[PDB]
Amino acid sequence: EFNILLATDSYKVTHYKQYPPNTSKVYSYFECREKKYEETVFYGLQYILNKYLKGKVVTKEKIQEAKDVYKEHFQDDVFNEKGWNYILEKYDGHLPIEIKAVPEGFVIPRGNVLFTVENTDPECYWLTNWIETILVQSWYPITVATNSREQKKILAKYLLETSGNLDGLEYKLHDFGYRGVSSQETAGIGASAHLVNFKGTDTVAGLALIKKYYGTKDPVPGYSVPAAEHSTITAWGKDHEKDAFEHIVTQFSSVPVSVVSDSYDIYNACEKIWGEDLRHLIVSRSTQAPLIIRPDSGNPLDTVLKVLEILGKKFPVTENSKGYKLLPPYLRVIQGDGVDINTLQEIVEGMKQKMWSIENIAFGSGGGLLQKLTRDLLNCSFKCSYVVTNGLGINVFKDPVADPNKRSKKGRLSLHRTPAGNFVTLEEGKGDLEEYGQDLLHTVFKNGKVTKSYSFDEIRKNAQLNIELE
Amino acid sequence: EFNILLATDSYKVTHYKQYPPNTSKVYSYFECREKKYEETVFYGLQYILNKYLKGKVVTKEKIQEAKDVYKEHFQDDVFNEKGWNYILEKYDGHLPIEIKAVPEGFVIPRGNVLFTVENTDPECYWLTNWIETILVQSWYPITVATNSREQKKILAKYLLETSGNLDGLEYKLHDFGYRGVSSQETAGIGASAHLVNFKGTDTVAGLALIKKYYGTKDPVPGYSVPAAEHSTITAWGKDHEKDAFEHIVTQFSSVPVSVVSDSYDIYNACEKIWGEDLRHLIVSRSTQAPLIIRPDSGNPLDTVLKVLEILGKKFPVTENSKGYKLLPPYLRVIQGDGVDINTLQEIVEGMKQKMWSIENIAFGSGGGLLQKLTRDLLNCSFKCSYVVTNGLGINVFKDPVADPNKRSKKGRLSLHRTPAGNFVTLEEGKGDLEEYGQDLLHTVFKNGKVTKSYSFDEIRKNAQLNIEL
Numbered sequence: 039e040f041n042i043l044l045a046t047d048s049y050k051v052t053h054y055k056q057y058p059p060n061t062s063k064v065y066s067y068f069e070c071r072e073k074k075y076e077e078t079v080f081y082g083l084q085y086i087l088n089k090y091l092k093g094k095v096v097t098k099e100k101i102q103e104a105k106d107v108y109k110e111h112f113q114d115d116v117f118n119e120k121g122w123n124y125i126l127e128k129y130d131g132h133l134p135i136e137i138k139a140v141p142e143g144f145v146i147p148r149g150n151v152l153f154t155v156e157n158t159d160p161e162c163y164w165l166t167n168w169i170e171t172i173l174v175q176s177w178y179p180i181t182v183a184t185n186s187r188e189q190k191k192i193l194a195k196y197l198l199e200t201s202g203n204l205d206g207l208e209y210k211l212h213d214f215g216y217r218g219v220s221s222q223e224t225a226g227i228g229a230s231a232h233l234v235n236f237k238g239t240d241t242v243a244g245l246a247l248i249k250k251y252y253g254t255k256d257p258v259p260g261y262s263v264p265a266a267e268h269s270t271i272t273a274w275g276k277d278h279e280k281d282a283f284e285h286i287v288t289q290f291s292s293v294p295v296s297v298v299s300d301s302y303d304i305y306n307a308c309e310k311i312w313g314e315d316l317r318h319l320i321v322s323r324s325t326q327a328p329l330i331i332r333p334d335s336g337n338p339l340d341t342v343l344k345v346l347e348i349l350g351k352k353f354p355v356t357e358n359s360k361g362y363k364l365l366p367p368y369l370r371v372i373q374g375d376g377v378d379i380n381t382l383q384e385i386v387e388g389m390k391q392k393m394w395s396i397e398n399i400a401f402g403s404g405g406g407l408l409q410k411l412t413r414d415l416l417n418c419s420f421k422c423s424y425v426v427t428n429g430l431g432i433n434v435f436k437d438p439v440a441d442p443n444k445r446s447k448k449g450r451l452s453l454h455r456t457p458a459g460n461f462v463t464l465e466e467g468k469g470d471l472e473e474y475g476q477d478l479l480h481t482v483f484k485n486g487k488v489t490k491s492y493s494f495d496e497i498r499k500n501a502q503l504n505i506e507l508e
Numbered sequence: 509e510f511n512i513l514l515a516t517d518s519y520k521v522t523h524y525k526q527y528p529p530n531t532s533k534v535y536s537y538f539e540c541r542e543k544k545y546e547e548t549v550f551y552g553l554q555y556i557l558n559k560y561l562k563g564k565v566v567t568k569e570k571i572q573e574a575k576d577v578y579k580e581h582f583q584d585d586v587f588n589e590k591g592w593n594y595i596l597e598k599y600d601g602h603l604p605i606e607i608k609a610v611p612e613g614f615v616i617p618r619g620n621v622l623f624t625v626e627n628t629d630p631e632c633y634w635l636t637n638w639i640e641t642i643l644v645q646s647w648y649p650i651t652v653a654t655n656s657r658e659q660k661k662i663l664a665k666y667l668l669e670t671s672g673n674l675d676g677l678e679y680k681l682h683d684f685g686y687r688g689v690s691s692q693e694t695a696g697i698g699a700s701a702h703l704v705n706f707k708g709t710d711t712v713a714g715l716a717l718i719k720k721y722y723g724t725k726d727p728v729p730g731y732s733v734p735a736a737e738h739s740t741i742t743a744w745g746k747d748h749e750k751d752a753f754e755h756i757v758t759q760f761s762s763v764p765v766s767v768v769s770d771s772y773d774i775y776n777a778c779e780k781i782w783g784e785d786l787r788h789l790i791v792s793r794s795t796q797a798p799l800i801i802r803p804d805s806g807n808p809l810d811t812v813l814k815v816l817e818i819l820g821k822k823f824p825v826t827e828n829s830k831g832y833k834l835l836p837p838y839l840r841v842i843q844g845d846g847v848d849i850n851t852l853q854e855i856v857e858g859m860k861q862k863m864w865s866i867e868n869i870a871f872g873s874g875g876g877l878l879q880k881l882t883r884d885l886l887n888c889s890f891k892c893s894y895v896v897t898n899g900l901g902i903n904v905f906k907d908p909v910a911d912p913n914k915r916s917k918k919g920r921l922s923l924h925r926t927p928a929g930n931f932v933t934l935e936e937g938k939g940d941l942e943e944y945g946q947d948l949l950h951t952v953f954k955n956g957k958v959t960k961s962y963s964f965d966e967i968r969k970n971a972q973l974n975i976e977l
């Protein structure tokens with residue numbers, strides 16, 4: 039079972055002995071520090087508050103366990119047993135911490151305070167940064183949600199340009215990342231973050247996470263369709279690819295079905311198998327049940343363009359009202375290999391140049407969407423900005439000589455709307471001067487309880503694109 | 509509770525309708541496909557077997573839960589309820605699967621079979637690839653362990669060259685990755701994978717994972733020392749950095765202590781604060797309890813060299829038998845910013861050029877060590893290579909025309925030692941000809957039971973570098 043006393047960076051176990059004597063308050067904050075990604079989607083803190091921080095998180099057993107582990111880990115007795123015992127005895131193991139945060143789903147420019155953390159009992163001055171490690175992992179859902187939204191911006195731009203509307207946008211980027219992430223827990227968190235922006239996912243783990251921690255009016259937040267993988271095509275044998283295709287599209291004759299078509303020769307599969315031998319089984323399909331052809335190898339752009347040219351010559355193509363080519367409604371393509379924010383851009387631009395509507399194509403992304411991201415991408419960072427020692431408040435910060443980008447904010451922080459309606463973070467307690475109206479941060483956690491929460495429906499609304507709002 | 513019926517890629521829910529009819533066997537394998545990183549450390553499967561796959565993993569409630577979710581998720585009834593019910597009824601919810609694997613810790617060249625998976629009951633042909641998603645996540649501890657070991661190889665080469673030995677090698681790369689990974693679970697898995705090669709970690713989650721799933725003779729597999737962060741320095745106030753330093757080294761006077769020294773001006777801190785104002789508190793320290801100065805910003809190579817240059821002028825430097833400069837034993841440096849396999853190499857080579865021994869330095873790595881890695885790095889991949897349909901075995905594979913690198917292996921596989929003592933994977937069941945000694949894959953899982961386990965001690969022994977052998 040999870041033990042918050044064993045869920046911190048080792049060195050933090052020794053920090054209670056390093057702060058100035060008579061420190062009664064440590065106040066810290068999280069930002070995506072300014073340094074391609076000008077704004078960030080704030081998402082994921084609510085998961086962490088509920089799963090890890092709320093309620094009785096300290097017990098006699100957990101304290102003894104941590105004591106025993108750290109004794110060996112440090113080869114010395116440095117663990118603050120008395121400190122954790124105080125929390126157990128005084129607060130029935132509930133953390134005397136207050137956390138204020140921007141609403142989940144909010145889209146906020148870089149370099150703004152997103153959440154703050156401080157102890158509510160002077161004895162627990164050390165607790166604020168103990169939980170840095172747990173809270174900082176919010177970088178991951180933030181970064182997934184943000185990068186996923188940036189890809190939605192690209193898709194919206196090109197879909198609107200080539201078709202004149204945004205129909206189906208929320209299904210244009212499917213999550214294929216389940217196998218390509220580092221753990222089951224990561225799969226659920228990352229998939230949930232993608233679902234802030236889109237509705238298509240194969241990472242089933244995200245559904246239960248959203249249901250438990252956020253909630254939606256709909257039964258599920260995300261959807262999928264039947265689809266083949268290489269094993270279900272190749273199992274039929276090298277000479278029986280056509281047989282596999284026929285079996286699969288006949289089994290799934292009245293729902294959409296994706297079929298990976300590159301097992302041996304994608305171009306042959308498209309031109310001869312789909313385009314000639316099985317063509318009669320494709321042109322009979324409903325608009326609600328298209329065949330989705332899935333290439334999965336080769337240069338992503340070149341392959342998509344060639345697949346489209348092949349299909350364009352075997353199937354009846356129309357020209358939509360914007361002048362772009364459109365496959366018949368029973369036939370679509372999905373590119374789910376080598377897709378990341380950069381290649382996504384390359385492919386839609388290349389399609390546009392060849393006069394193919396973005397209506398024709400959908401994308402899937404795996405490692406690119408959920409794994410190939412780090413804390414450095416948005417410079418997600420947690421720092422102390424204010425302490426009280428001997429009853430006097432001190433504005434504190436770091437400001438390394440060789441890297442001005444790592445300079446942290448000073449003092450008590452608040453988030454405000456500017457006269458032009460933008461965000462500003464006030465430092466040094468200046469929010470108190472009341473020149474900038476009310477603090478936009480909300481208290482979300484206080485003394486062991488979650489004090490404010492958001493449904494996944496609210497989060498999605500907050501995270502909408504301006505082009506969707508317009 | 510974790511529900512294995514909800515722990516697969518969505519489309520796999522539909523695959524039981526797609527395989528050829530009359531298929532009684534689906535046999536699949538995992539490899540780090542050949543395409544840098546020429547050999548891989550096999551580690552992490554045992555975690556997955558015990559946590560997720562063993563024992564009674566199917567119940568009536570879990571089947572109903574999956575049925576309910578998939579109904580909404582697909583807006584359709586596709587779901588092999590009968591198939592899952594069969595496992596529940598016939599096998600008390602234990603998976604009729606056999607997995608054979610190379611021993612954990614083994615170091616194997618790219619392009620070799622590392623483990624195979626197959627159903628043991630003809631009714632469960634669909635189950636082999638159901639569990640692909642969960643098993644393929646082994647890519648992560650494999651890749652962390654492999655990338656960590658490659659960094660150890662660089663450190664070993666340079667330490668040996670500049671010092672004449674490998675003393676302290678196992679503490680030269682510390683895991684600072686806890687806050688920089690995507691989840692608590694990842695933290696533990698990745699930290700454990702790093703401990704295959706090294707003994708220094710701040711990612712505490714790794715200790716409990718190793719204790720629970722692998723085990724060590726020693727109480728713990730990993731260690732740390734007291735150390736400062738920016739908060740414990742900056743809280744003293746901008747004008748009181750020296751007071752913070754003095755307080756911290758005095759609190760931790762008889763153990764090693766790392767102190768981040770770049771809050772305001774790393775160069776001033778080293779030259780004026782440590783090098784003058786507080787020098788008397790440093791030169792009195794034990795060899796078993798040095799001050800470890802930690803820069804944490806600026807160009808990693810440039811900052812390390814300038815820090816050594818400064819300290820070398822304030823503290824007595826010796827020249828070792830190899831001709832390299834060595835700080836006094838009470839004083840060391842750790843660089844834990846911007847360290848990955850590339851920059852690590854750059855720093856030790858830069859030090860060597862400036863005649864500084866690698867004895868002087870240790871490294872810490874966070875995102876570089878545990879997060880900035882993907883399944884693409886070693887091409888970790890799971891593919892079906894053999895099926896039995898209508899009582900006949902068929903060797904199956906993919907071979908996409910535009911990417912020969914994605915061609916997969918054919919038929920039943922086995923791993924063998926070559927006459928020269930290397931590795932070879934035999935395809936098409938050719939291992940049965942018995943020309944190549946015994947198969948190195950062992951049955952590790954069969955019908956819900958873990959059948960062969962390794963301790964963390966054995967794994968570490970298997971993963972040793974040639975240089976230390």
Ligand SMILES: O=[N+]([O-])c1ccc2[nH]cnc2c1
Pocket residue numbers: 212238240262263264265266296330372400402517518519
């Ligand atoms: O799993 N798939 O390959 C998959 C899932 C959903 C899809 N929607 C359109 N194509 C798809 C492929």
Ligand SMILES: O=[N+]([O-])c1ccc2[nH]cnc2c1
Pocket residue numbers: 049682708710732733734735736766800802842870872
């Ligand atoms: O957390 N640290 O900064 C840290 C931990 C362990 C160390 N061993 C040597 N330097 C260290 C720094």
